[PDB]
């Protein structure tokens, strides 16, 4: 079945986490975990949906994602049978690189490497949700609000099973390739908030 498939799978991350997303000891792969999900909000903005990206560090050292674009897609493709947005962040060699020489794995990785998941989507006038736990979803995705607004938000926090030695993230890493980003991305605003020390910047070019 599609259960066994994706366990199968998450599994094999796991096993192998420094292949999928960087070098776990180093603090290589625990940042490229933020930026894995910032990817995909930045290909949003791209594409005219997503003007702001917010990072932010939250004092239990899990980290959050938003942007303001369209929502990731809620509905059930008839032959997966689950949310397309649970089917993004569940289905599927980085070990030696190092910083910008790391390849796009996607966020099912990110997902398989946290000990928890929390996905928070607004789209078509609604506020849907969806938690995980080592990639395992507690729930089907599911509407909790009602909203005129929309996004997407991903807060992860990253599993100690995989990630030792640098285990907590450096805010000057993120704000320098968050900086790279922006200008390689011109007209998205990016901001970083660490709520540990209250630090914040705001990147952007025009
Ligand atoms: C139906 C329809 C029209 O197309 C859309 O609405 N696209 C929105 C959308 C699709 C896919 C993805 C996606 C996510 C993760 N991995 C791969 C892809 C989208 C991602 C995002 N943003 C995102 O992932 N932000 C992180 C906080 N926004 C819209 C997306």
Redesign the pocket.
């Known amino acids: 079945s599609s259960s066994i498939k994706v366990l199968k799978g998450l599994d094999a991350v796991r096993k192998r986490p420094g292949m999928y997303i960087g070098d776990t000891d180093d603090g290589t792969g625990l940042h490229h975990m933020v930026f894995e999900?910032?990817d995909?909000?930045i290909?949003?903005a791209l594409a005219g949906?997503?003007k702001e990206?917010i990072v932010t560090i939250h004092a239990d050292n899990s980290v959050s994602?938003?942007?303001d674009?369209?929502?990731?897609?809620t509905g059930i493709h008839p032959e997966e049978g689950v949310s397309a947005a649970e089917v993004?962040m569940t289905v599927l060699d980085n070990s030696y690189k190092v910083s910008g020489g790391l390849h796009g794995v996607?966020?099912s990785v990110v997902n398989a490497l946290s000990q928890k998941l929390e996905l928070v989507i607004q789209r078509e006038g609604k506020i849907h949700r969806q938690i995980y736990e080592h990639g395992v979803p507690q729930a089907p995705l599911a509407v909790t609000g009602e909203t005129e607004k929309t996004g997407?938000?991903?807060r992860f926090w990253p599993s100690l099973e995989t990630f030792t030695n640098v285990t907590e993230f450096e805010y000057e890493i993120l704000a320098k390739r968050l900086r790279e980003l922006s200008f390689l991305n011109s007209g998205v605003s990016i901001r970083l908030r660490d709520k540990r020390d209250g630090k914040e910047d705001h990147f952007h070019y025009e």
């Open positions: 999900v910032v995909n909000a290909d949003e949906h997503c990206i994602v938003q942007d674009g369209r929502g990731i897609p993004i996607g966020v997407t938000m991903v």
